[PDB]
Amino acid sequence: TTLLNPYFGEFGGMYVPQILMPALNQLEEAFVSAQKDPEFQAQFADLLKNYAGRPTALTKCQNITAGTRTTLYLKREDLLHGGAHKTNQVLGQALLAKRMGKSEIIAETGAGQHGVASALASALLGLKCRIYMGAKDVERQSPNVFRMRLMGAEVIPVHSGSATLKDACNEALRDWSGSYETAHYMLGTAAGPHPYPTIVREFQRMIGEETKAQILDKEGRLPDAVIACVGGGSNAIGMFADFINDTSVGLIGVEPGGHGIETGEHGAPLKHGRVGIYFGMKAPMMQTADGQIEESYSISAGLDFPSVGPQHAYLNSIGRADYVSITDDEALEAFKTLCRHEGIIPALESSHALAHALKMMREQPEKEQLLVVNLSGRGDKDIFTVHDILKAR
Amino acid sequence: TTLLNPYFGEFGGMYVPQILMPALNQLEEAFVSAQKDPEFQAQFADLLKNYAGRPTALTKCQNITAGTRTTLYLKREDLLHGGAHKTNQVLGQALLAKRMGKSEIIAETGAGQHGVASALASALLGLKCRIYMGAKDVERQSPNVFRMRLMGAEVIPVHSGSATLKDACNEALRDWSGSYETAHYMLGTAAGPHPYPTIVREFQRMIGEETKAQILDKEGRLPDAVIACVGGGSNAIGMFADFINDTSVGLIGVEPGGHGIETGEHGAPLKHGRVGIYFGMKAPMMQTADGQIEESYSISAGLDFPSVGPQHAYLNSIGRADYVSITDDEALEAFKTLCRHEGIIPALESSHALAHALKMMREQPEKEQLLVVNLSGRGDKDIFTVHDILKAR
Amino acid sequence: ERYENLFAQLNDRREGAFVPFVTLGDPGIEQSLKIIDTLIDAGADALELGVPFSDPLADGPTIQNANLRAFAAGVTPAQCFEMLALIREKHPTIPIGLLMYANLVFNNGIDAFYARCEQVGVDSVLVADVPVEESAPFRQAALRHNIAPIFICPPNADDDLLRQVASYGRGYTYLLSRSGVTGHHLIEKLKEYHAAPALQGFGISSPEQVSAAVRAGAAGAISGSAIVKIIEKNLASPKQMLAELRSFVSAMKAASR
Amino acid sequence: ERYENLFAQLNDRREGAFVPFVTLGDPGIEQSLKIIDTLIDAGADALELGVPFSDPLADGPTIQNANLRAFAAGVTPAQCFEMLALIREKHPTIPIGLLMYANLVFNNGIDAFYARCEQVGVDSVLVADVPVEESAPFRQAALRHNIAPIFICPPNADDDLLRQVASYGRGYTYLLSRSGVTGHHLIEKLKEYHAAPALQGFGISSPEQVSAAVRAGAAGAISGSAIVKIIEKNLASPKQMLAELRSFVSAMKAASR
Ligand SMILES: Cc1ncc(COP(=O)(O)O)c(CN[C@@H](CO)C(=O)O)c1O
Ligand SMILES: Cc1ncc(COP(=O)(O)O)c(CN[C@@H](CO)C(=O)O)c1O
Ligand SMILES: O=P(O)(O)OCCNS(=O)(=O)c1ccc(OC(F)(F)F)cc1
Ligand SMILES: O=P(O)(O)OCCNS(=O)(=O)c1ccc(OC(F)(F)F)cc1
Ligand code: NA
Numbered sequence A, B: 001t002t003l004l005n006p007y008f009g010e011f012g013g014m015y016v017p018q019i020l021m022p023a024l025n026q027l028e029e030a031f032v033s034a035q036k037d038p039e040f041q042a043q044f045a046d047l048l049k050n051y052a053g054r055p056t057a058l059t060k061c062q063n064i065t066a067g068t069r070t071t072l073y074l075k076r077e078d079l080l081h082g083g084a085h086k087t088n089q090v091l092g093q094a095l096l097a098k099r100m101g102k103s104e105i106i107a108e109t110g111a112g113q114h115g116v117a118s119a120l121a122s123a124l125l126g127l128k129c130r131i132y133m134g135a136k137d138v139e140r141q142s143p144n145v146f147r148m149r150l151m152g153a154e155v156i157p158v159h160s161g162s163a164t165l166k167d168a169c170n171e172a173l174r175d176w177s178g179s180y181e182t183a184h185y186m187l188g189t190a191a192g193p194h195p196y197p198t199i200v201r202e203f204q205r206m207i208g209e210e211t212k213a214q215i216l217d218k219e220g221r222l223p224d225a226v227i228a229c230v231g232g233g234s235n236a237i238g239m240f241a242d243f244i245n246d247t248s249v250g251l252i253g254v255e256p257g258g259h260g261i262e263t264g265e266h267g268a269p270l271k272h273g274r275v276g277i278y279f280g281m282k283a284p285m286m287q288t289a290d291g292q293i294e295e296s297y298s299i300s301a302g303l304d305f306p307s308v309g310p311q312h313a314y315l316n317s318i319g320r321a322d323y324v325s326i327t328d329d330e331a332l333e334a335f336k337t338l339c340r341h342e343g344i345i346p347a348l349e350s351s352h353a354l355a356h357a358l359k360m361m362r363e364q365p366e367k368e369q370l371l372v373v374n375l376s377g378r379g380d381k382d383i384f385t386v387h388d389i390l391k392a393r
Numbered sequence C, D: 001e002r003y004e005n006l007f008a009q010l011n012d013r014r015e016g017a018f019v020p021f022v023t024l025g026d027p028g029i030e031q032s033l034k035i036i037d038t039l040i041d042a043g044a045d046a047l048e049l050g051v052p053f054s055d056p057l058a059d060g061p062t063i064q065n066a067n068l069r070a071f072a073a074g075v076t077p078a079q080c081f082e083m084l085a086l087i088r089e090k091h092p093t094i095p096i097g098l099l100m101y102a103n104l105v106f107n108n109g110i111d112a113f114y115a116r117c118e119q120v121g122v123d124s125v126l127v128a129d130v131p132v133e134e135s136a137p138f139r140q141a142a143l144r145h146n147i148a149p150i151f152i153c154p155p156n157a158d159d160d161l162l163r164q165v166a167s168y169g170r171g172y173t174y175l176l177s178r179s180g181v182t183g184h185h186l187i188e189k190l191k192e193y194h195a196a197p198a199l200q201g202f203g204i205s206s207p208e209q210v211s212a213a214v215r216a217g218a219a220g221a222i223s224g225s226a227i228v229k230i231i232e233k234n235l236a237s238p239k240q241m242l243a244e245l246r247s248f249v250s251a252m253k254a255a256s257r
């Protein structure tokens, strides 16, 4: 039994070893009480504002839409401390950890952005932070690994399995199944067993809340659609949440299409995968016909979670949100275009959302539409990647 | 004759070839009119707020001052779009350029931060941007050179002289002396010939203005001292300006001490140089006994301007502001300390200001003092530098 | 069915059960079939068999490598079921339980998975990442196909859980020795609630551990990593592997008497 | 003093002045002294001499390298003044003007710099980065030491500037041929305001340019980069350098007659 519903339609649940259920029930209870505690909310708001930099700007593009009837705004999570939206919810989760009397933090990371956010929050709030990262990822993310260590976090390479995000995810749960008494597992996306999909959404929902206030102030109406990339689903559900009951507002999630859906080398399980049960939840996943779990391929390291949050699978199933995919090349073109026309360097993850907004505009240039793209992070971290690619071409 | 005073006591002036005087008079006139134009001010404010992310946070450290009577706040220019305070004034200067009917931008850069800010502002506002950078700097700043190019700016290596910032400065003036009719020279610090020291201060003064509002709101009183690093003087004068008439508020500028003042390998001309005339101004400079201009040495690439803004030399001379120096090792320790205790990665430039605040605290731990350090930029760009150093030790 | 008969027999001989665990196909089909035949011949009262899976998040390093080795050999679930049918054709009475991860069971249909278990002669299925809270469709399909659904009684449990594990489980109650992954008074309450005989597992690697479990009132003990370690340590020595396995098993089984 | 005498003489011979520029010490002390003696022998009516400086922001690439070469040779300002005293001891009447950057003049004191100029026999000083607007202490010190302060009359000027350049300057008025760095009706207004004779400079590299300047009413023409290019092109040929220099000068000087 739980206080909140662990399911979004058929998706979600708590598919974890029996030994970990007490930790999830404790976490759910701590979260429900925290959400009703004005003192917790004030502390969280103070950190978001005075430490992280909220509210973030809502920037109107003034060049990229020229010649069309599209008005495009970018929600600037790239300006948040840390360089991505990840920082929002780690601050909330770190405070939850302290409310439960926990002194240690376990986090998993693939690209390293959530790892860096976890480490910075842990350094600020006095938590001993250990991060699990697939060895393949540690190898290609030396910068973030060093940032995490400069911030005092213990970084632990995982060589098991494919030595990537999913294996890091497994290791974090293995650790937690033995240390939950003193450690909190700070999962980095809106996925995993309940209560995480819910907690992560609620601790990222200020993205959509601010966006709504900002667009009403600037345009006097709601957007026609809000667009966000989907790796695990946190930045997208954070943007979507406050608009779910505004039926006129389209919610568009963009999964990575990698080299193209037909090549099988992509990371789009919501629309091209098959429902399975893994990482504590029932959700669409990248899996072999036998049921073995596979990796998500994308030029962007952050759209690597091989499944997707259950609320997205649910919103898709009922037709409230639509999901699409963008290829490596389309994301690369959007990255180049924003740098050159707006002077903003977007994360390659976010570039997938921008690429789809560009397609909506370009495909029907005389369609009047007000769009908001969630710019989930900055792309300084992707400069070398983009450089070598273009140089190779 | 000019509209405004080109001198701060004995320092300043317009020491440029006769051919460039019309450009400076035009610029001064455009600036004076812009400062009285509500439409210009509204446009500048809109860009600062909705594009750059102003206001920036004022963060109270909650760990670094434990055990002492020092309360330390950090003014978060590291959260500004671009990653440093440089963005503020390039937006103003880019708008001035357009007001004058100019379509091209010339900028000089050493570390590349002002170069990146110039390129992003130029991309947003439709200006053809060419940046001059000493070839020695281009070599060690491949990342920023690539960002500038991704943003559409032409980057031009300067092999003359020491192939560093001063030579880039000379080249920018040589170019400008022949293209002023169509191009604006977007100087990056509060130095050079009038009107630049004045324009740069006025376009960076929101740092101190916001800081004053924020500290009054949070502490109900003004700081005992505001502290900032000094390369050329822009971030420091931006923080200092609004407090100059608040006589109880100490203004402390920190020049780079490099390997130590006694080694001669430093960048502290204000306190250890000699007045000279170069780069269009009369000011303290790094120079041989013969009068040849030398480079400033610092572990931080941005504290490389071999002279200092004239208003700082003036504020020092009358005792209104005090200047000190911090060595490479003290800056490195402050960098490590903020990462670990506050989860903020500071630019190595800014780390010089933080190091001096740490010294004020540590030297007299029972002195009650309210301090603000201007965190001029983030230090993601310095991670490799710090890494190799520590690894070498 | 087979578990009940086994426990009744063991009770008559006042002995506890010793149940070894191994990963199917580790380090290969043929050698795994031989390892399994050796375990049985050495005294194993029942078997716990893992189907290789990509993400065994309830297993320590030793078994994680067991899975890796099996994958290196190309072992698939379909092939595991062929191995299972053959093992049953060779040994008609030994209880065979599978250690599964939820996705392999849900993949082609839960009901279909348990039906295949029945077809090949499997006796029980323990799905490691399915807590009692999510167990309904699994335990229902298990019962429809005469398969015992195995539940985990963690050490950090309570009465509510105890009553559920007792009413939902069949075959044996998996009594966890501790928290963490693979590498007392509960027993009485279980008997109080007429739960399936308790089998203690996790960390069991010595004969005295087996004697202590049976003395505490457990029907027996399960041991896996200790068994898998003998395999990994003798990879290059196929025969010595069987011999050492034979030695450990007989010792452990002896402790149960 | 020497400029007045020279212009009076040239006026009597209805000829314009040809004034070459070179960097002192380029490419070395000795060779520079020889280059200078050659320029004089070839027809130079006066000399414009640069003191090597670290940041010559009013010079194009050709002269920037002239400075680099001199620095490669270790040439210092003190050594330039020793060269200047010797050149004057050898040539008593040729006007010698220095091309300076403000810091070298301000370094050890403005008054002291012009006093040293007088001591060695220099006739004028042009400080490239000191506009009329900042010229007061420089022109005052120049006059106190009988040195002509040279002012720049840019092409993009006006009456106000013209009147200032005319009242402040002495020796010759430097008439800029264009905007940019080293690589008509103004002349009349200058005469109207009794300005020092105008000498056109910047981009002068051919004989016809010299003839055109004198025809426009200029007292003569200055040429530097074209001269410095002959030096750089014959670095390995000391003698050929002098010969080519001799050739260019005589041609340019001939155009002035
Ligand atoms: C800037 C940015 N935008 C988007 C995403 C995708 O995740 P989301 O779908 O949870 O929002 C990430 C994820 N990053 C994860 C997974 O690798 C991490 O461990 O850092 C990101 O770093
Ligand atoms: C983060 C940060 N903080 C401080 C400074 C020092 O300059 P300031 O004294 O003008 O503020 C710089 C300068 N940067 C100059 C000079 O190299 C540039 O061309 O990028 C900086 O980049
Ligand atoms: O001797 P050890 O420590 O290796 O333990 C034996 C391991 N093999 S097993 O099938 O019992 C087994 C059974 C259930 C498991 O996970 C769960 F408890 F979460 F359900 C993990 C392993
Ligand atoms: O023939 P060029 O084009 O090389 O011109 C000759 C250059 N040597 S010079 O002493 O006249 C000379 C004089 C003044 C200069 O700068 C200033 F105009 F700003 F003051 C630069 C060079
Ligand atoms: Na995904």
Ligand code: NA
Residues within 6 Å of the ligand: B230, B231, B232, B267, B268, B269, B296, B303, B304, B305, B306, B307, B308
């Ligand atoms: Na300086």
